[PDB]
Structures are given as C-alpha cells and as structure tokens.
Amino acid sequence: HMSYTWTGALITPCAAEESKLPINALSNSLLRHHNMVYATTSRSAGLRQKKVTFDRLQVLDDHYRDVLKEMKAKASTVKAKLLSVEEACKLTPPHSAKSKFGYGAKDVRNLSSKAVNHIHSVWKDLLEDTVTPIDTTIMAKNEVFCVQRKPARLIVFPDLGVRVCEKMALYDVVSTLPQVVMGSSYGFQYSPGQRVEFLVNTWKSKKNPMGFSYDTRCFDSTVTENDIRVEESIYQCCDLAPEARQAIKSLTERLYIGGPLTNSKGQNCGYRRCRASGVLTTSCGNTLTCYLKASAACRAAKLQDCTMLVNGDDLVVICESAGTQEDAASLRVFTEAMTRYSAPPGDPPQPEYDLELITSCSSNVSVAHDASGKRVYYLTRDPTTPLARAAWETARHTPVNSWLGNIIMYAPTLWARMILMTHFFSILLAQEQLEKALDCQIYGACYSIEPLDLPQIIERLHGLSAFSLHSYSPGEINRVASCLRKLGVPPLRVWRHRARSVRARLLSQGGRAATCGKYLFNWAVKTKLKLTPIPAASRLDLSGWFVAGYSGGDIYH
C-alpha cells in the first residue's frame, strides 16, 4: 500500500531552471535581501520523492460509512451535463502543457482539426477501454519562496488530449457537486468578503467558540485507492449521460486510482498509487475526501455544534468549547480518527479561542476600521511569500502573475495596498501597460484580467471599505514590519511617498487610470477624495469566479 514505487530514473526539467532571484533595475526598490528569495527546481525532486513515499493504512468505521451515505444522498440530487469538444477546448489555458501527439494549447483553443481529431479518438478510447493505465508526466514545479529550503512540489498530469476529455465528462460535476454535497461548508463558493462574513457569523453563533485548522501531512499521498473509488461512487450518484458514466468509470480505473509516471525525457520514473496533483478532479476529490474524513472524525471526537469550512486539502473547524483540557483531548481523538482514515497531520492541531489566531489557506481574519470608524473584518496572511514572488515577477515575466491574484484576493490588506498596488502600478505606468490584460489564478482557475478593472473587481469581492480601511491591528502591523526587515523592503513611509507619485500619475491620465488613482490610492493622501460606488462594478460578469476550486485542474475562465 505504498503511495509511490520508483525505478531510479530522475524527474527531469523541460527547460533551463533558475533557482536564484533574477535582478534588474526595479528589484532594489522592492527588496534588498536578494539571497533570501529562491525558486524550487527539478534538482531537489529526489528529496520530495522521499517525503511523499510511504505506506498507507486505512481503518474505516461506522461514522465514516454514515457520513458517506449522507454525502451520496445529496449527490443523487445533482444533474450534470456532458460538455462538447468546443466547450472543453475553450476551458484550456493558453500556456497549458502541449500534447505528445503534435499539438499545443493554442491549437486546442483555436479548435485546430489535428487537436479536435485526437481529442475524439481519446474520448472513443475512454468509452471502449476501462483497464489500460493512462500514462502521466511527472514534473517538478518551480515555485518561489523566502528561506526559513523547501524541495520542489511534484505535478503529475496526463496528456492534453486526456485533460480535454476530463473536462467533457467531469467539468460540470466538479463545479456543481461539492456545494450540493457540503452546502455552506464548501469554501470555494465564497469570495474573500463572503468567507469573512461566514467565519465571523459562525464564530459569533457559539457560546464559547473554539476553532482549529487541520493540516494533513502531504494530503495527495495519503489518498488511497479506496478513497478514489469512494469519490467515483459519489460522482456516479449524479444524473449523467450514459457516455459520461462510462468515461468517469474509465478515467477512475485508468487514471485517478493510479498509473505509470514518465519524465519529460520519456523515461519511466515509477508508479503512483495515490492522488495525481494535475487532474481535473484534484480539488473536488480532495475536498470530498477531506470533508468525509473530517466529518466522521468530528463524530468520533464528539465535537459540539461543529461547523466546518473545507476547500481542497484545507480544513477549518469552529465548535463549542468544553474548556482547554477537554478541547485538547477532543482534538487528540479527532487526530487519531483522521490518522486511522489515512490523514495524519503535519503539525498536531491546536485549539484557538481568538478567531484572529486560526490560520487556514495560509490566511487569518483580522480587523481594521472603515471611514466612519466602524470595525471591519478582512482576510490577511503573512506577506513573505507574496513579497518574495513579487520580487521574482518584477524581473521576470511569468505565465501566472501572483501579484495580480494577491491584489485581487488581499485588496483590504495593509501590504497589498501600500506595497503591491504601489510597486506594480508604478511598473505599468512606466511601460504604458495599464490596458494590457494579465493572467492570474483564483482558486486554481486561470483568468485574463485588465489591471484598470481592479477598482470594480475589489468593490465586488470586498466592498468600498476595502479602499478606506485604516487603524489596522498592532499584531498585523508588527507582522508586516517584521517581514519588511527580513526581506529588506523599504519602510511603509517610503511606500506612502511613492504612492502619492503613482496616484498623481494615474489621475493626470484621466478615464479608467484616474479611477485607479482615486480608489486604490485614497489612503496615500491626507485630503481624501469621495469614494461612491463604481458604475462598472455592477456591469462585471464575475460568474464562474467563486463557484468551485480547480487547483491543478488546467482551467481557464
């Protein structure tokens, strides 16, 4: 019952890999301690292969089968449509990994006959064959972090032709099923503003609230064949077209359960008997499995008035406290149950009695004040990884702009407003690239966004208060300041000075640029401009944004 077996062949790159932070003329204005920033490469993949390779033991009790039966009853109310080739092709990112069969993502997006023909033959083969393991590529991801070094994460993905077929059979399932099965517990249905509201409302609804986050050590590797067959049995409860049922059963037996791993050089690296990180069902499967195991663990631990918030492999639980002794013992029993279900933790969970102390999705709730002095709750995170990635993106073009996603998702934060908006609007002004649409990810899905649309997007996700927050918490300020000293980032006063320049430059330009200057940099000036709602905010087609998670799912919206 090993998560992986290996041949000894190495995980190889597809191009030249840089691990050291690239430096240009704009680097120093953002970050001085360059040596602190690094990118993971395939050369550390051997260290990751060791960490993810282990035996899985699974003991399934009555709480587990009880929760499963309820999940299946809710799943039986779902009706899912089969997507056409064209529809599935349009969901493919432009920079998605090319096929081994002579076509790429642009060919798929342009509906080229060679791509469309191969997709049809892959589909027919899924319907005809339910036993042949589907080949996957194993690659090391190149992700940027600040030191204290993490080994590269591994991405396991089938061919582009299989990926388009997964969309046809399961895109509607993975987009509609989680919210039906989990209701309000499904976290990917919420914008950051709706998630804040949900958590504060849940925390308030308890007499003596207690909360914790459960961090499973390498979740993908803890996912067993049993778990993947349980997920398929959940998908099979839906009202599906007969071709979709057969494709789902085939994709499960041939791909989802496991299969051979091939490097970029076409060599066999070994065999996967756990979750693939680069399939359409990664996010949905992980969400369901985590919800199933955590809900059964909640029953085994006898947690009182339990409220969960699950999204992918990330889990937040809020419940009624029984005092620090009984809470510690309840969390030990919850951990023991999760361990038996093959989901042991990285760090053992800790009970928290202050909402602001619970960390999940690397985020925590914090408080600031609006223009009328009223308390406003927002989601924040340690700005180290966002700032390290922004330093990389200042000197190199990347297929996903993490700074853009970070401004969108963390717009109310002190660091996104003063540093990220200031730095990147300065770069866009100098290059006259304000109107150029940039790629970013929201819950694993890829989006092409125009920076000039940022004030309307932020209003819709966070409200106008996002442009007026002040009097941030001492804890938040100290965490931001501590990060700036560590990375060698200029103090917040320098950023204020730079923002007055960025704002004036945006205003001088009029139109949409002036709107950016007005709303995004109102914090920079003492004499504040009046921020009324934006007409274009209501015109925004923000559908598909907070519907589901698609991490590793190769989705473009």
Binding stretches for ligand 28M (CB under 6 A):
187, 192, 195, 282-283, 286, 311-314, 361, 363, 379, 405-406, 409, 441-443, 549, 551-552
CB atoms within 10 A of CB 358: 22
Residue among 161 and 312 whose Cβ is closer to ligand 28M: 312
Residue nearest ligand 28M by beta-carbon distance: 312
Q: Check whether 313 is labelled as a binding-site residue.
A: yes
Q: Check whether 314 is labelled as a binding-site residue.
A: yes
Could you tell me which residues come within 8 angstroms of residue 49 by beta carbon, excluding any fewer than 6 positions away?
4, 6, 11, 154
Residue among 475 and 488 whose Cβ is closer to ligand 28M: 475
Residue among 407 and 429 whose Cβ is closer to ligand 28M: 407
Smallest distance, ligand 28M to C-beta of residue 360, A: 8
Smallest distance, ligand 28M to C-beta of residue 381, A: 7
Q: For residues 5-38, b (16+ Cβ closer than 10 Å) or e, as one string?
A: ebeeebbbbeeeeeeebeeeeebebbbeebebbb
Smallest distance, ligand 28M to C-beta of residue 279, A: 10
Residue among 240 and 365 whose Cβ is closer to ligand 28M: 365
CB atoms within 10 A of CB 183: 10
Tokens 């929201």 identify what position?
A: 442
Residue among 82 and 196 whose Cβ is closer to ligand 28M: 196
What SS3 class is residue 410? coil
Could you tell me which residues come within 8 angstroms of residue 218 by beta carbon, excluding any fewer than 6 positions away?
51, 52, 346
Smallest distance, ligand 28M to C-beta of residue 153, A: 10
CA distance 235 to 218: 24
CA distance 340 to 346: 15
What SS3 class is residue 146? strand
DSSP state of 447: E
Smallest distance, ligand 28M to C-beta of residue 130, A: 26
Q: Contact 493/480 with Cβ under 8 angstroms?
A: no
Beta bridge partner(s), residue 448: 439
Smallest distance, ligand 28M to C-beta of residue 220, A: 7
Q: Check whether 554 is labelled as a binding-site residue.
A: no
Residue among 209 and 383 whose Cβ is closer to ligand 28M: 383
Residues tagged in the binding site annotation = 215, 313-314
